[PDB]
Amino acid sequence: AKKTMGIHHITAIVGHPQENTDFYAGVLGLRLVKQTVNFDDPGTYHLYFGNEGGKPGTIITFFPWAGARQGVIGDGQVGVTSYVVPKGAMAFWEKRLEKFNVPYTKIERFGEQYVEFDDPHGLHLEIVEREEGEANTWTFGEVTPDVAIKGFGGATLLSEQPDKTADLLENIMGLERVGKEGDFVRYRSAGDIGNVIDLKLTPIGRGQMGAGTVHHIAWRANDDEDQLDWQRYIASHGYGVTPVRDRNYFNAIYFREHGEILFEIATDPPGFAHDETQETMGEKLMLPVQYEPHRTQIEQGLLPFEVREL
Ligand SMILES: [Zn+2]
Secondary structure, three states: OOOOOOEEEEEEEEOOHHHHHHHHHHHOOOEEEEEEEOOOOOOOEEEEEEOOOOOOOOEEEEEEOOOOOEOEOOEOEEEEEEEEEOOOOHHHHHHHHHHOOOOOEEEEEOOEEEEEEEOOOOOEEEEEEOOOOOOOOOOEOOEOOOOOOOEEEEEEEEOOOHHHHHHHHHHHOOOEEEEEEOOEEEEEOOOOOOOEEEEEOOOOOEOEOOEOEEEEEEEEEOOHHHHHHHHHHHHHOOOOOOOOEEOOOOEEEEEEOOOOOEEEEEEOOOOOOOOOOOOOOOOOEOOOHHHHHHHHHHHHHOOOOOOOOO
């Protein structure tokens, strides 16, 4: 079958863009690498945060719509998004969360210690220390390369049918089974980031779509050719798959897996530096060219916000 390097990006519906940004840039120190709009709804932001380069495996993306049409975290969703930091950096993050009045808990699984906390709109996050994965050199506030979030450590999936999700991850998608512990089976992809995928083995009841939930998880393809191969393979192995959609910073295909999680395969190229320079990406509102004749309509409707140090 096929083999993905790991997570490309994760996409979530959240609340006010300023609140979202104050958390992901202000607290977590991630770079806003692209501000654009939702391809489907031009009157809604689509914000992309990541490491200094917005590299695949570091990219968290948001549809911020203020007013919180709140969903419920449950089966058929990514339950927890995992962020990896350098070895020894746990205390930096614990003290920083405390400074910002963000409660956290400490849990252990598979011999690793995790800091668990929620973002302002209810998404479940965690931080884990690992040597693997390139340092994030985006300096923002007190966040420096020796402590900065390097990207995703992985994610924890809540599946309506965990046996089917496991079969997909291991036997179709080429992830290696690490083992089982507690209520989890763990899988590892071959990349050095976005690579540790935990699957909860007992269903906790179906989630509800809406704000404060993860919308989908995207897995990496090396290039357009690899993605086309994925489309052919996935469609012939028991799933519905969309046509390729050009999202400007990558091409995308989507398929809902049997545990009801929405998966995506996204190409590593071209990335976020091809309609803005690497040094300025994230600074201007970029639009799908189809909407450039409505820039006035579009901007008039978007809430202002700024990336700011807290
Ligand atoms: Zn996506």
